[PDB]
Amino acid sequence: DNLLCNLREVQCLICCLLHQMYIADPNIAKLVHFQGYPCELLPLTVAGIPSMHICLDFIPELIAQPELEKQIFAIQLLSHLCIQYALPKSLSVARLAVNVMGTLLTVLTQAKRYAFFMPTLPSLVSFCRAFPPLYEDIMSLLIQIGQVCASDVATQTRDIDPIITRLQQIKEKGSMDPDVQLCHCIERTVIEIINMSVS
Amino acid sequence: HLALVELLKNLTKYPTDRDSIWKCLKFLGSRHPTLVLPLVPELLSTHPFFDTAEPDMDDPAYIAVLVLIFNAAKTCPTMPALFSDHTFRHYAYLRDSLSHLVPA
Amino acid sequence: QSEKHLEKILNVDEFVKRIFSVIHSNDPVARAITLRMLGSLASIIPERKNAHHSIRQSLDSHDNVEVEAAVFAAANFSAQSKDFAVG
């Protein structure tokens, strides 16, 4: 049941070993996070390994990597690190990541925009949760991404046409178009941001 | 707040009087509870969103602040949730060490 | 191995402080080793309240080596201090 299972104890033992190994060599932690691991492990690694706060040192270096997967993983890792550690330098790296996403909005093509912004959009909810000063930057970025992604929805004919559904209520929490999926992801992320900030 | 600032700079200028100054802040917190309550985020350096560094224990200015705060929190249970985690740990430490000053 | 010679150091405060600084390490093994240091030094620092608080806090930790070291430190400090023993 994700808490009273053998998998939880195995995860704790592995997290303890990784904590010891990262203390013994932080360069191993830097190399592993440059290689990357599945993002399902990210909350487990951030919560269970206390020496994960040193990842904020090379997240500015990791987010500058040419490969898109490295930048996606850097943003997703900083997402959990800002929740775990709300540092002033964590805020600086969060501002850097917001600027990187704003720049990659205007650098990447439409397929690359989908493949980059679908995983990294839930990171903005955690960025807003850790740093309430980031509300203006996150909301301006979300307006920009949504207005960019509505335009190529209008470019091609669509099977569901989300422009008409601009007046929709709060919905409950497969072969759809990538642009419409990205529009729904933007709407979902602003829904979670507003729900988090209201609570 | 002015009384606390003057007591703290007296503590800096004369560290021998730390027990008497702690008694002063115990009596000030215990008898002026509602007035200390809005002053708590100004005394404990509690950022609204940043995770604050744990203050150095056994630093006589910081115990002096905590003795004032905890004695104010004894008679007012309205806002004891303004404490962070390390302030609760320091509350346990002062209850173990300075139990004649800090109350339950 | 040098328990009889550590009663003649007389710069107790800064020595114990620089050992005690790594009770705050996130490593449970380092915390366990420091608890064993404090229990080993309990002959020359009785009634040292931050050591008592560290033993009390580490007795409730979730790491087995840290809890065992806290038990060892508590056994040493209870022999050398009655104010530690009563709580």
Binding site: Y22, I23, P26, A29, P50, S51, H53, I54, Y85, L87 | D51, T52, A53, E54, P55, D56, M57, H86 | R18, S21, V22, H24, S25, N26, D27, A30
Partner: peptide, 13 residues
């Protein structure tokens, strides 16, 4: 340092 929390108390020599 990887062995200490960022919110851990600092060591002043």
């Amino acid at each position: 340092s990887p062995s200490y929390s960022p919110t851990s108390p600092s060591y002043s020599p």
